[PDB]
Ligand binder design. Structure first.
Ligand SMILES: COc1ccc2c(c1)C(=O)N(c1nc(C(=O)Nc3cnccc3N3CCNCC3)cs1)C2
Length: 263
């Protein structure tokens, strides 16, 4: 119905996380997003993490309010919707659009990693667009601290979404946070340029993944991707996280720096 001065007008999504509604102030007409969670900390950590975020490519956190067993997180509304909906199945989107979104995604991720936070569930469904089609990273429910007091801590928990998770997450007891988020970004880039995900999961039991390791790029989705961006994907989707390209080096990539124009 409504929270304090805000009216909940439309459902922007629902799942195990609860539900997200578009809240409109009856007085000012201002619009924000409200995440409603049933208590039925988990949310405490998410709240603490959101409180430390301040970046143009990260969904802003305005505050929260508790009402019994119900917790309300006030977040930045993104009228452009989910990046997922800009990906035409089997087609993808124009390369210039994909490059722009990728640059913005990198900016957001560099920001997070800079403050010692890893997102852990980067995928098109969690990447939102504002009124100017600027990309914003959302959903910090799986986010965690991987660097504190200049000391890195390896991760061990299994979390994320199979098609987007890095292989080491499935094979190693402990692993570095950063290369996992980098890998997810590479899968997102693949989806944007091909309109399809490369594999159900990055395992040996997965034929699609095995095909990629053997470099069978004459197959989909790789055959749909231009040589320049494909060269970047060859550097990102590297099984060994230690050999995987880092963000500083992604920013030096030929395709990343290629001027593109639609149309
Ligand atoms: C215009 O159409 C839409 C459609 C969907 C959405 C919006 C606009 C919009 O602003 N949404 C917003 N979602 C958030 C947010 O923090 N969401 C969010 C937070 N916590 C867990 C899950 C979340 N979402 C589930 C749905 N996919 C995106 C992430 C902030 S704004 C979701």
């Amino acid at each position: 119905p409504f929270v304090e001065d805000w009216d909940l007008v439309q459902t922007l999504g629902e799942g195990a996380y609860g539900e997200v509604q578009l809240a409109v102030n009856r007085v000012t007409e201002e619009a924000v997003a409200v995440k409603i969670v049933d208590m039925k900390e988990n949310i405490k950590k998410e709240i603490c993490i959101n409180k430390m975020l301040n970046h143009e490519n990260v969904v802003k956190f305005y505050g929260h309010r508790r009402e019994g067993n119900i917790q309300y997180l006030f977040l930045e509304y993104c009228s452009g919707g989910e990046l997922f909906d800009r990906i035409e199945p089997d087609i993808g989107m124009p390369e210039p659009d994909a490059q722009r979104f990728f640059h913005q995604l990198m900016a957001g991720v560099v920001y997070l990693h800079g403050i010692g936070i890893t997102h852990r569930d980067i995928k098109p469904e969690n990447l939102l667009l504002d009124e100017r089609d600027n990309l914003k990273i959302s959903d910090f429910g799986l986010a965690t601290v991987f660097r504190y007091n200049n000391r890195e801590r390896l991760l061990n928990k299994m979390c994320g979404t199979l098609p987007y998770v890095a292989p080491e997450l499935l094979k190693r007891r402990e692993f570095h946070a950063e290369p996992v988020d980098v890998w997810s970004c590479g899968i997102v880039l693949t989806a944007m340029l091909a309109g399809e995900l490369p594999w159900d999961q990055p395992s040996d039991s997965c034929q699609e993944y095995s095909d990629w390791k053997e470099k069978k790029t004459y197959l989909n989705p790789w055959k749909k991707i231009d040589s320049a961006p494909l060269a970047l994907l060859h550097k990102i989707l590297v099984e060994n996280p230690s050999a995987r390209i880092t963000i500083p080096d992604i920013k030096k990539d030929r395709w990343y720096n290629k001027p593109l124009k639609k149309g």
